[PDB]
Enzyme design. Sequence first.
Site, mmCIF file in Angstrom:
data_model
loop_
_atom_site.group_PDB
_atom_site.id
_atom_site.type_symbol
_atom_site.label_atom_id
_atom_site.label_comp_id
_atom_site.label_asym_id
_atom_site.label_seq_id
_atom_site.Cartn_x
_atom_site.Cartn_y
_atom_site.Cartn_z
ATOM 1 N N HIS A 151 44.071 -47.212 -58.601
ATOM 2 C CA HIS A 151 45.451 -47.112 -59.056
ATOM 3 C C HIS A 151 46.465 -48.005 -58.327
ATOM 4 C CE1 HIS A 151 44.560 -43.948 -56.121
ATOM 5 N NE2 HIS A 151 45.814 -44.058 -55.718
ATOM 6 N N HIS A 198 45.977 -38.182 -51.415
ATOM 7 C CA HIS A 198 46.282 -38.858 -50.153
ATOM 8 C C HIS A 198 47.763 -39.241 -50.118
ATOM 9 C CE1 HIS A 198 44.711 -42.757 -52.266
ATOM 10 N NE2 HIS A 198 46.013 -42.648 -52.454
ATOM 11 N N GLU A 251 49.765 -32.837 -48.109
ATOM 12 C CA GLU A 251 50.042 -34.261 -48.281
ATOM 13 C C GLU A 251 51.435 -34.646 -47.781
ATOM 14 O OE1 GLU A 251 47.763 -36.465 -48.983
ATOM 15 O OE2 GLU A 251 46.371 -34.782 -49.163
ATOM 16 N N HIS A 300 51.787 -35.555 -44.151
ATOM 17 C CA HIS A 300 51.431 -36.951 -43.870
ATOM 18 C C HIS A 300 52.624 -37.848 -44.227
ATOM 19 C CE1 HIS A 300 47.242 -36.380 -42.924
ATOM 20 N NE2 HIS A 300 46.874 -36.020 -44.141
ATOM 21 N N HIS A 352 46.231 -35.295 -38.724
ATOM 22 C CA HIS A 352 45.398 -34.114 -38.892
ATOM 23 C C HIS A 352 45.383 -33.289 -37.614
ATOM 24 C CE1 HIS A 352 42.896 -35.784 -42.489
ATOM 25 N NE2 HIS A 352 43.839 -34.961 -42.906
HETATM 26 N N1 LIG Z 1 47.826 -18.853 -50.009
HETATM 27 C C1 LIG Z 1 48.642 -19.896 -50.133
HETATM 28 O O1 LIG Z 1 49.434 -20.037 -51.062
HETATM 29 C C2 LIG Z 1 48.530 -20.951 -49.029
HETATM 30 C C3 LIG Z 1 48.510 -20.328 -47.631
HETATM 31 C C4 LIG Z 1 49.793 -19.524 -47.418
HETATM 32 C C5 LIG Z 1 51.000 -20.461 -47.355
HETATM 33 C C6 LIG Z 1 50.905 -21.285 -46.070
HETATM 34 C C7 LIG Z 1 49.506 -21.887 -45.920
HETATM 35 S S1 LIG Z 1 49.020 -23.214 -44.952
HETATM 36 C C8 LIG Z 1 47.377 -23.228 -45.427
HETATM 37 N N2 LIG Z 1 46.385 -24.077 -45.126
HETATM 38 C C9 LIG Z 1 45.174 -23.960 -45.686
HETATM 39 C C10 LIG Z 1 44.177 -25.112 -45.561
HETATM 40 O O2 LIG Z 1 43.090 -25.074 -46.136
HETATM 41 N N3 LIG Z 1 44.621 -26.147 -44.853
HETATM 42 C C11 LIG Z 1 43.809 -27.354 -44.642
HETATM 43 C C12 LIG Z 1 43.965 -28.280 -45.850
HETATM 44 C C13 LIG Z 1 44.746 -27.898 -46.937
HETATM 45 C C14 LIG Z 1 44.895 -28.752 -48.023
HETATM 46 C C15 LIG Z 1 44.265 -29.993 -48.029
HETATM 47 C C16 LIG Z 1 43.461 -30.361 -46.955
HETATM 48 C C17 LIG Z 1 43.324 -29.513 -45.862
HETATM 49 N N4 LIG Z 1 42.820 -31.605 -46.946
HETATM 50 C C18 LIG Z 1 42.916 -32.414 -48.082
HETATM 51 O O3 LIG Z 1 42.406 -33.533 -48.099
HETATM 52 C C19 LIG Z 1 43.610 -31.924 -49.183
HETATM 53 O O4 LIG Z 1 44.589 -30.889 -49.002
HETATM 54 N N5 LIG Z 1 44.914 -22.908 -46.570
HETATM 55 C C20 LIG Z 1 45.943 -22.015 -46.889
HETATM 56 O O5 LIG Z 1 45.713 -21.091 -47.668
HETATM 57 C C21 LIG Z 1 47.205 -22.176 -46.326
HETATM 58 C C22 LIG Z 1 48.367 -21.454 -46.601
HETATM 59 ZN ZN LIG Z 2 46.976 -43.898 -53.936
HETATM 60 ZN ZN LIG Z 3 45.040 -34.883 -44.709
#
Ligand SMILES: NC(=O)C[C@@H]1CCCc2sc3nc(C(=O)NCc4ccc5c(c4)NC(=O)CO5)[nH]c(=O)c3c21
Ligand SMILES: [Zn+2]
Ligand SMILES: [Zn+2]
Length: 163
Positions: free
Chosen positions: A68, A83, A119, A122, A128
């Site tokens: 893209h 990303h 995202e 970032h 990370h």
């Molecule tokens: N339950 C929800 O609505 C999300 C939950 C409560 C709100 C605050 C947060 S922060 C968080 N963080 C995670 C989690 O897996 N974090 C690591 C992560 C998350 C998203 C990503 C990635 C890693 N890496 C990627 O490449 C793509 O996007 N999971 C959650 O449920 C969570 C929540």
């Molecule tokens: Zn791109």
């Molecule tokens: Zn990331």
Amino acid sequence: MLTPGNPKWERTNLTYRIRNYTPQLSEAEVERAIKDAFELWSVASPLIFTRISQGEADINIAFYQRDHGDNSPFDGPNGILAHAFQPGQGIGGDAHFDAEETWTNTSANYNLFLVAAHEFGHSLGLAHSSDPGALMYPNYAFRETSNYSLPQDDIDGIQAIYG
Ligand SMILES: NC(=O)C[C@@H]1CCCc2sc3nc(C(=O)NCc4ccc5c(c4)NC(=O)CO5)[nH]c(=O)c3c21
Ligand SMILES: [Zn+2]
Ligand SMILES: [Zn+2]
Ligand SMILES: [Ca+2]
Ligand SMILES: [Ca+2]
């Protein structure tokens, strides 16, 4: 925790623009997911996010497939989900989501709000994190919960950059 190099925005009021959408959710659900994802970071910093639908926003958001234009192609179903680019002009700060993925507003793979929140970190200059319970952890893992607020590790990360 903070995106390497240390590049960051120098203003506190930034603009963003949703350039296109995904057929899996209504345009309103997409806009809401983005707004809520920005809110998580806004309540823990001086940053204020404003939307525009025309003109050059600071943060461009878009759904693309495979190649893209930025030399970083997506890979079809699963795998890379999206990303984003570190703060800067031009493509800096922009965030792209893989259009071939299933996007939801539920606990089903993959929740747009959660991926977007990650995202945008970032886009703001965070790197990370090693903390498995942090939003900025490398791997996606939806966590069923009632408290929809930024994990403490991400709060430390953003405060470290913008106060
Ligand atoms: N339950 C929800 O609505 C999300 C939950 C409560 C709100 C605050 C947060 S922060 C968080 N963080 C995670 C989690 O897996 N974090 C690591 C992560 C998350 C998203 C990503 C990635 C890693 N890496 C990627 O490449 C793509 O996007 N999971 C959650 O449920 C969570 C929540
Ligand atoms: Zn791109
Ligand atoms: Zn990331
Ligand atoms: Ca930009
Ligand atoms: Ca993919």
